[PDB]
Amino acid sequence: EVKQGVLVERNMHFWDMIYNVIPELGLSYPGQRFQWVHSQEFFFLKKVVITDHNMNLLGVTPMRKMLVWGPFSYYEQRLRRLSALLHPDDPILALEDPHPALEDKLHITYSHRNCINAGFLFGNLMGLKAESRFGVMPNHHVDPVGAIVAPYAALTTGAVLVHIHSDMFTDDHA
Amino acid sequence: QHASFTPFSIQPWQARCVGASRRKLLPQMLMYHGARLGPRPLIILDHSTKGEAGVAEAARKYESILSQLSWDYGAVYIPLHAQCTDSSKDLLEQSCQRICAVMDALDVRWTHFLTYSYGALVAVRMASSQEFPHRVGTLMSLDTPLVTREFLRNMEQREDIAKAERDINVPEDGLAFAKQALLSSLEGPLPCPAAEDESLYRDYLFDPNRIFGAGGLVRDESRYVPLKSLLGVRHPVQLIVPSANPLSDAAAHSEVFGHRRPAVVKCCQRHEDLFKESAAKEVAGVLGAWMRRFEPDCFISKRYEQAANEMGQLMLSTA
Amino acid sequence: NRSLLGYPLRRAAAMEMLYGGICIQHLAQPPFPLRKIQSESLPPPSLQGERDDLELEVKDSTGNVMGYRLFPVNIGIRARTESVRVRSEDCYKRFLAQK
Amino acid sequence: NEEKWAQAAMEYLHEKRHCNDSRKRQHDVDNERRMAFAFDRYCSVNEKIFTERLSRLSDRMTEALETIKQLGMDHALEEALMLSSEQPPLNFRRPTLTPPVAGYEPGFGLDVPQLRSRQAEYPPVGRPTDAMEFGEEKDPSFPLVESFRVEDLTTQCLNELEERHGEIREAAPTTGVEGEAWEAYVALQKKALARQQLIFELCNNGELRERYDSDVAFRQRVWEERGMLPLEIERERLHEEPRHYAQEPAYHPFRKM
Amino acid sequence: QFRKLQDTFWSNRKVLVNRVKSMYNQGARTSAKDMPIKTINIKAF
Amino acid sequence: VWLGGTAANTSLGRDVMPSTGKYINIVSPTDVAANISAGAMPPEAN
Amino acid sequence: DTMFQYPVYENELDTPHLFNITEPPDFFVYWNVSDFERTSYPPLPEEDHRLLLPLSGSAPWKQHRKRSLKYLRKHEILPNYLPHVRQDVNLSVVFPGVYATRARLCEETGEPLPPPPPVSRMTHRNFWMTAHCGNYIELADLQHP
Amino acid sequence: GMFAEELSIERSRFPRFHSTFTIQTDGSLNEREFEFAVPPIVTLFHDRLSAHRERQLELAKIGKLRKERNWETEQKGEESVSMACNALAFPYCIPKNMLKRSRVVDPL
Amino acid sequence: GFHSQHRTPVLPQVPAAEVQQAASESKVRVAYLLHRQPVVKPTPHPLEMEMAFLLQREHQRYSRHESSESATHFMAQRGQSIDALNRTDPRQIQSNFFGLELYQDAMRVVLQRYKPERRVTPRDLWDPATYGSSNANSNASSPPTRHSLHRKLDDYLHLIVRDEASGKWTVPQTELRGRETLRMAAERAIATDNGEGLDCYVWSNAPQATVPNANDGSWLFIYVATYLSGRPKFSEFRPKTIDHAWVTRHEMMQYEENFQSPELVRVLLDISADSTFES
Amino acid sequence: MNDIYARRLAQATMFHQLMRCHGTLWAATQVTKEQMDYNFIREEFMRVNGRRAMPLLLGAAANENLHQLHLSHLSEHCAWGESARALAVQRQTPLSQRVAALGRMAETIHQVKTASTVQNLFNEQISCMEGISSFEEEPL
């Protein structure tokens, strides 16, 4: 944000924004972890994943934490039972177009092979050899630079992706 | 209207209301500053006591403030014996049974306290300990720290490190780093605003040889009082702060005892300027303003006159 | 031993009753008791249970429904059905390549 | 216009079950938990002192009664064991927030005779014994009535109370503190009535009386089948019960910041 | 839904008290139990 | 009618969640399975 | 809340929470990127059982052996692969685990990490690295005798 | 009935309570609270002890202030009934071999 | 929260014509302990005041109707009046609350005239000085005279007297005659010993306490009653009074040295009243 | 700050009421052979004193007379008069009683509106607290 004509970082409290958008999470009656719809006005919202690095050594209580470790099954893992039912042209990703072609095209949408081949074409055209170091300027994860081209270039051919400082826009962390 | 402290002894007719098992522990010398003792006075506690020679002198320090402040109930000094070799756990409990024997003999419950020193600890031990909150109405401490920041953080980390030591999931990196973090900052004892209780703090209470075993990890505060009991007292506790470099960081007070801004004396710069009769006017002003909040006469009269003025407003709004 | 109402009654209501209709005493309620679940009382792990616990939508005879939700809505339905049939054909051919 | 007044009045009657306040946060909820604990810790001494003092009082009066039983005045017994039925008088005065002031006549001698009218109390009270005095077939001595007319009262009260209890248990279930309070009240009433018809059963039948007196087990099992069973009050908590991670309440946690 | 539901109430109660009065003119002394409103006292109407 | 229940919470591989609280005021899959208005969906629907 | 409760077992020797998975109930779930290096093994129980002498009159050993037999039945070892199991002795087969999630190497050389010292006495740190009846141990720590 | 972090005060019953200083007819004043809008410092007529003084006044009209003796009341009323109970304690009644007595009356 | 005797009857007692031989032979005496109400409520603890704040805030926020500040505000919002003068605005309702102008004048008068009575008595402000000089010079100190009934309005003040012959502190006593009951004995005691100058309410029927005298072979029944109003003239006390005292639950242990029996103090303490119950 | 006063004055009232009801209880314990001890006493005081008040729209609730017997009037403490909300527990809020009367159709709308005046409801409440009321000795 702009202070004295100069770009300065602000810590926006996004928590406020979530509770402004969805006021009904504040009114808490002692049945409501389990009601079917958490907000009657967004009825498709089910979970909100909060990501913050809390530097405490103790883990969080498992009822706010999702299980990320170990075998999730007995007989076979269901992800490869699922992956047979998925097709490489199934779109999975969406990005903004700051200059939309038409009124209609808002977020242009990407698929498996779009991303994979973007990454491979970039990795093939420049040149990339294993364990060679490959940097990305930050704040590019919302346009297909650090979201698509870079990390898939790092994945497809052997390389090492490198993130510089989390943001760009100020002189100090430049 | 400067008025000295008159020495006093509890007579044997008043000694009977104290139980025969503790009739041994109410002391020989006491004091009354005010002409009349009231149903409940201001009771003033101070540093450790060896004989009455130091008591007479200790008296004078509070004499100026007490004389500036008029309390119908006035004030009683209860001295505190330094220590007893016979029992390791004797000290705070001796002070317990002693102060409450004195209160029983004077037929006094519900009492405001003042302490500059060790006695405050004792008073917390009144309020913090179960089954002696009903005696202490209000604790006030002039500059004495009950709790400090570093105890708060370090004890937080000790609890969390206990939990983490019990948990297998926590990797050895974070655990070892937390251990070196605690060992990097080891708690120094409370700052002591008493000339004679420094030896008491270093020797008895806060000696590093005892209070933490498996050093810097498991802290036994059972000698004084744990943290949960400190955090557990809701008795109103007012902290007085001199208006220059203080003791008793009030962040920790406002975190533990509650959210109340410590009364700051403007006249003082540092402490030891508290007991001079320059700042005594402001200090006694604060003390009196704090006393009259809890006396039924004062706040019932106050709210009555507010209601009366509100009706006056209704009366001139009538026409 | 037994009680006339069967559960030990909490002090709130008690002290509320013998100081008639007043709750100023214990208002901070203890947390509820736990019910422990026996982990060996559970049935043996079943394969079909592993198949359907995810609850996928592909086992419907109406069509490949999961296919419809992964496909654009911009297409007329009768031209979209024979589209989704084509992607569900390619998933098959690829399944066979894998095999 | 009277019906819309009635409607708004109904509106004033209805209690709504409303959620927790959204302005609540973690620290003030936690420190009111804290303050509640401090207060209970404070009232512990008062209530256990009160408890044991009542105990001692009843011990003293019990040994007084057994004194006069021992000395052999068996008349004095049975006129001392009837309830002294006169209430505290009209000059028995409220302990009052302030003392009375010097020479106060009401309004300092300003009389408004409209305000000194004595009036009705609602609802009008009537009690199950009022049918026995002011209704049909009155008794010549009302506090002194013969046994079976009291027994009929007991047996009709068990049935009518049971019925009412069932009805309101159907139409308006209540749980939690007030729920348990109410259920405890009903249970206690039933216990009382039950023991009443019990002592009728013991005082007419001397054989059941002496077989009751002869052993102990028979006593407590007869207590069991008749619903006379103790009321368990759980112990006093002075501190926070340590929680398992599953011990969280069923709503979304309070907002910290 | 709610508004017309709560209006229906005030409609039906004045209806039924009108019918209570029109049963009370014909001298039928209706007990309290066979009335649907079973705390109702007709002498108050 | 308070619409809620533990059904929305995904339970994988066995449901160990207390079963008295699964669906509250919502029709179960069993309730629609015993109530369908069609009849005999064909053997080729398998 | 008896109908609304997160499942709590008393014997996690099967480590069922890795297998029978119940969703976090909380609307706000907290997922860092740090928690990928956190091994999620069940908490240390009270009554550490492997210290127990298997005396026939001892109650904790009785309840433990019936627990073990029921675990053997639910995984269908007992009827099926191994029809007769006399439970006499209290067995503990323990592994020198470092609790490292994946397989690692040496940063200094590029070698496989050297074989750890064989465990002398059982400890609480050692507890989930044993063979229990039914539990899960990572492959990365099962690499040595 | 479910476990809640907030303290359990019986919520959503007590509509609203505004405190008021009430001056009793002896000049002492209490503070008691009500449901509706109440003005402060209400001067109260028709009190308990005021009604007591009214009763004393109208017993002075008759002359009955003096005393009512039960000990030097020497009445021979003795009528022994076999089975009788004290109806004034209904929860615990008992079948005693009792003695008949008239209740004391004070008309007013 | 007092009840009035509604229809409730009260049964007198019976002077049994049988002259009781025990009441003649063995000495049964009835003693009355007379206590006065606390005039005022107990002063609270600051814990109590702070929790009062807490509970007020929470009833404030969890009230049956939240946004509406009263019943008056509630109905006025809905355009309907509760008042007899059918007024809506709550301020003008609480301005003349009773619609009587004479009452308004009473209000103005009380507004200028009235001041609350300070609740502390000059009686109980105690001197260590003069009394310790009395104790030092005499070498023996006895409790200050509790003769005053106005002493402290907070607790229950009881009545303790001393037999002039006995020279020790004792509750008022009277011997029981043949025909009358214990209730009646206590009542004739209070009445005739004070000479009908007391309105004395009596709580119970049965006697409260019993203490033995082996030297007298006598049983004493201690009996608790409340003092309403009157003029307690103590010259008329037949068992030889020297001084009376109005005595809180606390100092009855203070009175033990000049007390006639050690058992009597313990029992009297047990059935003595208290307003707080913290001791 | 009323209830805090209320239970102190209630604790004062309890042993005074105990003194009178102890004869009755003691008589009852040699017939039933029950134990006379605190656990008996306090459950005797609980049934007298705590009496929950119901919605009163039920009518079934209003009908319950057990609380008002002669022993129950003679063992009950005066605590309820001191605090309005304990009164609101045992009885209900004085307006909410009277409108409940017209809810169960036990009263005309007009005769509720008649008595439901603020001026009335102040007076009946102070009268009720202090123990002053109208007596009809003959009910029907």
DSSP G53: -
Rounding to the nearest 10 degrees, give the CA dihedral for residues J118, J121, J125, J131: 130
- The 3-class secondary structure across I106-118, one letter per residue, is HHHHHHHHCCCCC
**Among all residues of chain E, which has the CA nearest to that of J59?**
E39
The Cα I6–Cα I9 span in angstroms is: 9
DSSP states of chain A:
-EETTEE------HHHHHHHH-GGGSS--TTTTSBS-S-SSS-S---EEE------SSPPPTTTS---SS---SS--THHHHTTS--TTSEEEEEE-SS-SSSS--EEEEEHHHHHHHHHHHHHHS---TT-EEEE-SS-TTTTTTTTHHHHHHHHTT-EEEE-SS--SSTTT-
- Degrees, nearest 5: CA angle B286-B287-B290: 85
Q: For residue A143, is it left (φ>0), alpha (ψ between -120 and 50) or beta?
A: beta
The Cα G143–Cα G145 span in angstroms is: 7
On whether the CB atoms of residues B212 and B264 are closer than 8 A, the answer is no
The Cα H24–Cα H29 span in angstroms is: 5
Residue I166, CA distances (Å) to B36, F7, I259 in order: 34, 86, 10
Whether the link from the prior residue into D143 is cis, omega within 30° of 0, is no
Which of D39, D54, D145, D222 is most worth mutating to test chain J (most J CB atoms within 10 A of its CB)?
A: D54
The Cα D6–Cα I52 span in angstroms is: 35
The Cα G131–Cα B87 span in angstroms is: 51
Q: Residue I53 is inside which H or E element, if any?
A: helix I46-62
- Degrees, nearest 5: CA angle I51-I55-I56: 115
Contacts with I185 (C-beta within 8 Å, 6 or more apart), sequence order:
H71, I30, I174, I176, I177
Which of D251, D255, D256, D257 is most worth mutating to test chain A (most A CB atoms within 10 A of its CB)?
A: D251
On whether the CB atoms of residues B115 and B222 are closer than 8 A, the answer is no
Which residues of chain G neighbour D249 with C-beta distances below 8 Å? 1
The Cα F38–Cα A94 span in angstroms is: 41
Q: Do D252 and G26 touch (CB under 8 A)?
A: yes
- Does residue C43 belong to the interface with chain J, where contact is any CB pair within 8 Å? no
In a 13 Å sphere around the CA of A65, the CA atoms on its Cβ side amount to 19
Which of C17, C19, C22, C36 is most worth mutating to test chain D (most D CB atoms within 10 A of its CB)?
A: C17
On whether the CB atoms of residues B237 and B141 are closer than 8 A, the answer is yes
Helix D147-171 vs helix D176-204: crossing angle, to nearest 10: 160
Q: Which residue has the tokens 């009175």?
A: I255
Q: Do J130 and H47 touch (CB under 8 A)?
A: yes
Q: Do H103 and I95 touch (CB under 8 A)?
A: no
On whether the CB atoms of residues B114 and B142 are closer than 8 A, the answer is yes
Pick from B234, B212, B277, B14: nearest CA to B128 = B234
- Does residue G6 belong to the interface with chain D, where contact is any CB pair within 8 Å? yes
Terminal-to-terminal C-alpha distance of chain I: 26
**Among all residues of chain B, which has the CA nearest to that of D35?**
B234
Count other Cβ atoms within 10 Å, centred on residue F22: 16
The Cα D189–Cα D184 span in angstroms is: 9
- Does residue D94 belong to the interface with chain A, where contact is any CB pair within 8 Å? no
Give the rounded distance of the alpha carbon of D234 from its chain centre. Answer: 19
**Among all residues of chain J, which has the CA nearest to that of C18?**
J46
**Among all residues of chain G, which has the CA nearest to that of C43?**
G74
- Please state the length of chain B: 319
Which of J1, J83, J87 is most worth mutating to test chain C (most C CB atoms within 10 A of its CB)?
A: J83
The Cα I56–Cα I53 span in angstroms is: 5
Count other Cβ atoms within 10 Å, centred on residue J105: 22
Pick from D222, B127, B197: nearest CA to D214 = D222
The Cα D224–Cα B262 span in angstroms is: 61
Subunits in contact with chain A (3 or more CB pairs closer than 8 Å): B, C, D, F, G, H
User: Which three-class secondary structure state does DSSP give residue B12?
Assistant: coil
Which residues of chain D neighbour E10 with C-beta distances below 8 Å? 3, 7
The Cα B215–Cα B183 span in angstroms is: 8
The Cα D14–Cα I64 span in angstroms is: 8
Which residues of chain I neighbour B107 with C-beta distances below 8 Å? 248, 250-251
- Does residue G26 belong to the interface with chain D, where contact is any CB pair within 8 Å? yes
Q: Which residue has the tokens 């076999």?
A: H82
Which residues of chain D neighbour G28 with C-beta distances below 8 Å? 252-253
Pick from I276, B225, C20, B293: nearest CA to D43 = I276
Q: Do J71 and H38 touch (CB under 8 A)?
A: no
**In this structure, is the dihedral angle defined by the CA atoms of residues I165, I168, I169 and I175, taken in order, positive or negative?**
negative
Helix C11-18 vs helix D176-204: crossing angle, to nearest 10: 60
DSSP B191: -
DSSP states of I119-185:
S--GGG---HHHHHHHHHHHS---PPP---SSS-SSS-BEEEEEETTT-SEE--EEE--SSS-HHHH
Count other Cβ atoms within 10 Å, centred on residue B37: 24
Chain D, 212 to 231: residues with Cβ < 8 Å from chain J are: 212-213, 219, 228, 230-231
| Surface-to-core class of residue B287, CB atoms within 10 Å of its CB (0-12 exposed, 13-18 middle, 19+ buried) | buried
Contacts with B214 (C-beta within 8 Å, 6 or more apart), sequence order:
none
User: I84 is written with which tokens?
Assistant: 């007899």
Count other Cβ atoms within 10 Å, centred on residue G13: 21
**Among all residues of chain D, which has the CA nearest to that of H81?**
D146
The Cα D91–Cα J30 span in angstroms is: 37
Name residue I209's beta-bridge partners: I222
B15-23 long-range contacts, Cβ below 8 Å, gap at least 24? B15/B105, B16/I253, B16/I254, B16/I256, B16/I257, B17/B104, B17/B105, B17/B107, B17/I250, B17/I251, B17/I253, B17/I254, B18/B101, B18/B104, B18/B105, B22/B97, B22/B101, B23/B101
Which of C38, C39, C42 is most worth mutating to test chain G (most G CB atoms within 10 A of its CB)?
A: C39
Name residue G105's beta-bridge partners: G112
On whether the CB atoms of residues H108 and D169 are closer than 8 A, the answer is no
- Does residue H10 belong to the interface with chain C, where contact is any CB pair within 8 Å? yes
Which of C12, C31, C32 is opposite residue H8, by nearest beta carbon?
A: C12
The Cα G103–Cα G126 span in angstroms is: 19
Dihedrals phi, psi of D94, to nearest 5 degrees: -60, 130
User: For residue B154, which amino acid is it?
Assistant: N
Count other Cβ atoms within 10 Å, centred on residue D102: 7
- The 3-class secondary structure across chain C, one letter per residue, is CCCCCCCCECHHHHHHHHCCCCCCCCCCCCCCCCCEECCCCCCCCCHHHHHHCCCCCCCCCCCCHHHHHCCCCCCCHHHHHHHHHHHHHHHHHHHHHHC
Measure in Å the smallest separation between the Cα of B308 and chain H Cα atoms.
7
User: Which three-class secondary structure state does DSSP give residue I41?
Assistant: coil
Method for structure elucidation: cryo-EM
User: For residue A71, which amino acid is it?
Assistant: P
User: Which three-class secondary structure state does DSSP give residue F32?
Assistant: helix
The Cα H15–Cα I68 span in angstroms is: 10
Which of G5, G12, G73 is opposite residue C39, by nearest beta carbon?
A: G12
Q: Do G27 and D252 touch (CB under 8 A)?
A: yes
Which residues of chain E neighbour J111 with C-beta distances below 8 Å? 44
Q: Do B294 and I127 touch (CB under 8 A)?
A: no
Residue D191, CA distances (Å) to A90, C21, D158, D198, D221 in order: 72, 21, 10, 10, 15
| Surface-to-core class of residue H74, CB atoms within 10 Å of its CB (0-12 exposed, 13-18 middle, 19+ buried) | exposed
In a 13 Å sphere around the CA of H14, the CA atoms on its Cβ side amount to 26
Give the rounded distance of the alpha carbon of I41 from its chain centre. Answer: 12
Interface E–J counts its CB contacts (< 8 A) at: 19
The Cα B284–Cα B2 span in angstroms is: 13
Name residue I163's beta-bridge partners: I241
User: A91 is written with which tokens?
Assistant: 């779109």
The Cα J46–Cα C22 span in angstroms is: 12
The Cα A35–Cα A25 span in angstroms is: 12
- Does residue C16 belong to the interface with chain J, where contact is any CB pair within 8 Å? yes
Pick from J68, J82, J72: nearest CA to J45 = J72
Name residue B132's beta-bridge partners: none
Which of B39, B107, B236 is opposite residue I50, by nearest beta carbon?
A: B236
Q: Do A56 and B160 touch (CB under 8 A)?
A: yes
Q: What is the resolution of this structure in A?
A: 3.4
The Cα J51–Cα I112 span in angstroms is: 44
Interface of C with A (CB under 8 A): 45, 47, 50-51, 53-54, 56, 58, 66, 70, 87, 90-91, 94-95, 98
The Cα D24–Cα A25 span in angstroms is: 12
Measure in Å the smallest separation between the Cα of A30 and chain H Cα atoms.
6
Q: Residue B55 is inside which H or E element, if any?
A: helix B53-68
Which of D33, D35, D41, D49 is most worth mutating to test chain B (most B CB atoms within 10 A of its CB)?
A: D41
Helix I46-62 vs helix D26-70: crossing angle, to nearest 10: 120
Q: Which residue has the tokens 């008690």?
A: C14
Which of H10, H13, H14, H33 is most worth mutating to test chain C (most C CB atoms within 10 A of its CB)?
A: H10
Strands B75-81 and B30-32: antiparallel
- Backbone discontinuities in chain B, residue before each (C to N > 2.5 A): none
- Does residue D177 belong to the interface with chain A, where contact is any CB pair within 8 Å? no
On whether the CB atoms of residues D71 and I26 are closer than 8 A, the answer is yes
- Does residue A71 belong to the interface with chain G, where contact is any CB pair within 8 Å? yes
Query: In the structure, do chain B and chain E come into contact, i.e. share 3 or more CB pairs under 8 Å?
Result: no
- Degrees, nearest 5: CA angle B278-B279-B280: 95
Measure in Å the smallest separation between the Cα of G88 and chain F Cα atoms.
32
DSSP J116: T
- Degrees, nearest 5: CA angle G125-G130-G131: 160
Pick from B234, D36, D231, H11: nearest CA to C25 = D36
Q: Do D7 and E10 touch (CB under 8 A)?
A: yes
Dihedrals phi, psi of I247, to nearest 5 degrees: -125, 120
The Cα H44–Cα D107 span in angstroms is: 8
Which of I119, I142, I257 is opposite residue B296, by nearest beta carbon?
A: I119
The Cα J54–Cα J60 span in angstroms is: 9
Query: In the structure, do chain C and chain J come into contact, i.e. share 3 or more CB pairs under 8 Å?
Result: yes
Interface C–F counts its CB contacts (< 8 A) at: 18
Q: Do C53 and A89 touch (CB under 8 A)?
A: no
User: Which three-class secondary structure state does DSSP give residue D68?
Assistant: helix
Count other Cβ atoms within 10 Å, centred on residue I100: 14
Dihedrals phi, psi of C91, to nearest 5 degrees: -65, -35
User: D210 is written with which tokens?
Assistant: 């002496």
The Cα B240–Cα A111 span in angstroms is: 68
Pick from A15, A47, B153: nearest CA to D26 = A15
